[PDB]
Symmetry: D2
Subunit: 258 residues, 4 copies
Amino acid sequence: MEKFLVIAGPCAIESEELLLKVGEEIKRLSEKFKEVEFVFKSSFDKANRSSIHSFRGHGLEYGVKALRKVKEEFGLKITTDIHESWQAEPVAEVADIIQIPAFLCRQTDLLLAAAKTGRAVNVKKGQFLAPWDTKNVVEKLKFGGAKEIYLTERGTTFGYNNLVVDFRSLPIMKQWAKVIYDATHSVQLPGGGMREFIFPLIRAAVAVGCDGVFMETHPEPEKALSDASTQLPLSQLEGIIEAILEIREVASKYYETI
Amino acid sequence: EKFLVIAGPCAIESEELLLKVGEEIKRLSEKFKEVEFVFKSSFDKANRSSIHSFRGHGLEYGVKALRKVKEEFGLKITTDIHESWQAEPVAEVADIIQIPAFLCRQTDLLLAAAKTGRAVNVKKGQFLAPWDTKNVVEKLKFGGAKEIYLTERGTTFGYNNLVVDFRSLPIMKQWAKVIYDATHSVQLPGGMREFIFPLIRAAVAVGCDGVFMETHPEPEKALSDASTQLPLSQLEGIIEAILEIREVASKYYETI
Amino acid sequence: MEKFLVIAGPCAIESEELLLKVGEEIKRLSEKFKEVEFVFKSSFDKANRSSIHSFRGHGLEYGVKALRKVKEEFGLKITTDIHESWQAEPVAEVADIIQIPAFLCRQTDLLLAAAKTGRAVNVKKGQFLAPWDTKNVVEKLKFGGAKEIYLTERGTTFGYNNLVVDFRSLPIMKQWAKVIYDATHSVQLPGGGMREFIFPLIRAAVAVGCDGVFMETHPEPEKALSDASTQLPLSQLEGIIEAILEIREVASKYYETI
Amino acid sequence: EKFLVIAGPCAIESEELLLKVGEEIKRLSEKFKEVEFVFKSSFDKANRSSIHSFRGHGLEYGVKALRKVKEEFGLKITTDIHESWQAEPVAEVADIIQIPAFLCRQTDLLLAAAKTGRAVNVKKGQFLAPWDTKNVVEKLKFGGAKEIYLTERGTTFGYNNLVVDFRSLPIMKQWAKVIYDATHSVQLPGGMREFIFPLIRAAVAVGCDGVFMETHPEPEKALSDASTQLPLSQLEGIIEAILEIREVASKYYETI
Ligand SMILES: O=C(O)[C@@H](CO)OP(=O)(O)O
Ligand SMILES: O=C(O)[C@@H](CO)OP(=O)(O)O
Ligand SMILES: O=C(O)[C@@H](CO)OP(=O)(O)O
Ligand SMILES: O=C(O)[C@@H](CO)OP(=O)(O)O
């Protein structure tokens, strides 16, 4: 079985300190769960918040420098998201995996900018996109030179201010890329979020079969500057990870062949 | 209480077919003692899209064939009703009376079912939000029902498509035992066999009280739900798989 | 141009008196709007309420007798809905148009029970049904002997507790039956309702093109026993009808040919 | 203020095509003096599903061709931007800067557009509820924009389908002028020409401040939105139709 990916970290780079605190914990779990490839995630810019008054971040320069500290202090791989083509090059200096936001999954130039860096690229599936329509997204990355591609399931528009997770997307997308399940954005209520469903839905994802999971986690979610109602309390991370590795193991012999 | 597996051919195509399927379910029944098996088949497909499609052989012949399965194999029975008058005659043989998803809000049908003293399983309508099943349960309690089940079978997602919102499992559990219907949840109304097993794995990882699966020795030849009925020979493997997943996952099912 | 249909009346037969009061007003409008075919509607049983504690009605016998009074006192056509096959025969004694509830639009026996009465049949399109899938519904009625058939647009499931009206359904369904737009149920919030959208959406319906409209109306909606937030104040009916006849007239030369 | 009609070929396939279309719009412009016509064409289809599809001839060539239309015919101009840097160069020719629907929440793009001093039209995202456009308008006001439009273009309805919820027209009007996009609202993402005219009739019966329509002398030969671009010759008839409907219906538009 392939090394399972767990992408995790605070939603936003609130400070270099917050980063070091989560990083410390992620490093501890990586030493325990040696069958997992851990990737530390945090955004240097929440460029698509609903409100002009909401927290965005401290800028690209500061964020890359704080992620670089996490990588240097803990030896952890790094992923962060870009919003315009010009950011691909500077971010690629620290990011092992460049993330493409869900609203931007069809922006050709942004995808090509990420792909020519030589870094892996993970595209969040747009809330508007059918799972079979990710085939062209992967084709655009492969055309642009990307050799390691991920597609992340994060819910689909289901009426107003609600997302539903159609688990059929996991085996469908697996036909053309590795698949990541985003356990924290899939339960958000666009323009909101329900923490009580994070755990059940992530159990469903590993029972269906995916190649990794993505989770935002913060020492104190209620105090977070972004995604306060969906970020997972840091102390709860180890137990969630153990549970998914257990459920994955027992379901794995039944995963179907693409 | 023990995990429920409700299984059988979609339609009572013949007393014979029920006996063949009944035999295999009897067999699995002896192999998996911790599971409560309930044999299912419909005496009438009362809501087919086309007037030219197979409906069945009538309630009399159907109850007779189901009686034969219960007598011959000792299996509990479940079938669905479509109008209030059918509840009492079906209750002579059915341990569980099933309410069709389009009929989940028909007050008299629910009350007629509750009045028989039998257990009632209501398929959640494709139009119903999970929190709105609380009133469904309340109707049945008011009607005297004491063993109540709610079955997840997908929700309307645009035209000719259903999506399973797994958040409904924990929500519905606040007021009834919850069953996951593995075969209708992937059908395309007005489906895809390849998604049956993956989604049933999800349902037990999330946590449910039972699973519902239509099965037929030769699905391609079935007269109803031909595209989604599970081949009978695959049933054992899927049941063992979900008992294994449940065993591990149950440690994590959230309290009520 | 065909005589436009306006189906209207109180949601439920709260009393024979309420019926006579609305009937009086509908009769007055029928004398004014002679280009409209008016049909008086009221249910003898709200058989599918969400709550066991909600108002259902005073029974079939009482309801048919109250509708028969309206027909006899005002000379108005009558429509009411059935819920089980056995009710088709007694209701057909008074109802010119037998209505099939939206949740029951695929119940074969109920449709055949209505069709063999020789009365017109109007089927509410299920909130789960695609517009092209009404073709088989009409085929079932024609097979059962119905010679005058209507399909009513009343919204489609759009996430939880919300309905959306896809106006493309009007020209699609028109391929096989006369089409009615239900102005009051289309704005209800299943398991709720928004009165402010009734008027705009009914203007859209006649600009697209339909063969009639359906509206629930009560002298005092807030006091209604069913659909209190969507029933139209009776005093507002005349002005709505004048507006739709005006918009219909001006749009009509552009209605496309089926 | 007067009713807006924004029209033109989806993509700047060539300075020529724009001139042919510009000529017809100039003509209608003289025929319908109460209407403010705005000529539209995209210099880059930056979000095509396939890497092998037509994107265009670049921003430079595009701004040049649009400048030619404004110089030659005196028509106001609108085109869309895809990244913040494009706002200032596009603002030399565009009276209205268009924000793509997938990019309606990208704060910097909205701010870059507002900073040019031009009017801004934001296509409402297929994922956005109508009440959630209030924050979109607030971003643009904060950015200095004073003439703001919100365009209805359909909402995600299951997979590969959009539905127009007309309730959004009156809701969005509380905070901006509202335009109805008649051609993308009926496209099937990842459409149907037969529904364009019926839905545009609905939009003016409900009440909007303008309509948006892509038009091409020969849609079948277009390099983008070939399935939905309106044949140029049909444009006059549809504009006269909607002015007639609006004239009658406007008596009933609800206050703000
Ligand atoms: O993970 C996040 O921080 C965001 C941005 O990429 O994800 P999404 O676009 O899926 O909301
Ligand atoms: O299980 C079935 O036979 C049918 C009828 O009860 O189910 P549903 O109503 O969910 O289609
Ligand atoms: O008009 C009504 O009173 C009801 C019942 O027929 O309609 P619907 O089923 O469309 O909710
Ligand atoms: O009108 C268009 O050219 C496109 C781009 O702005 O529209 P939308 O983003 O609505 O697809």
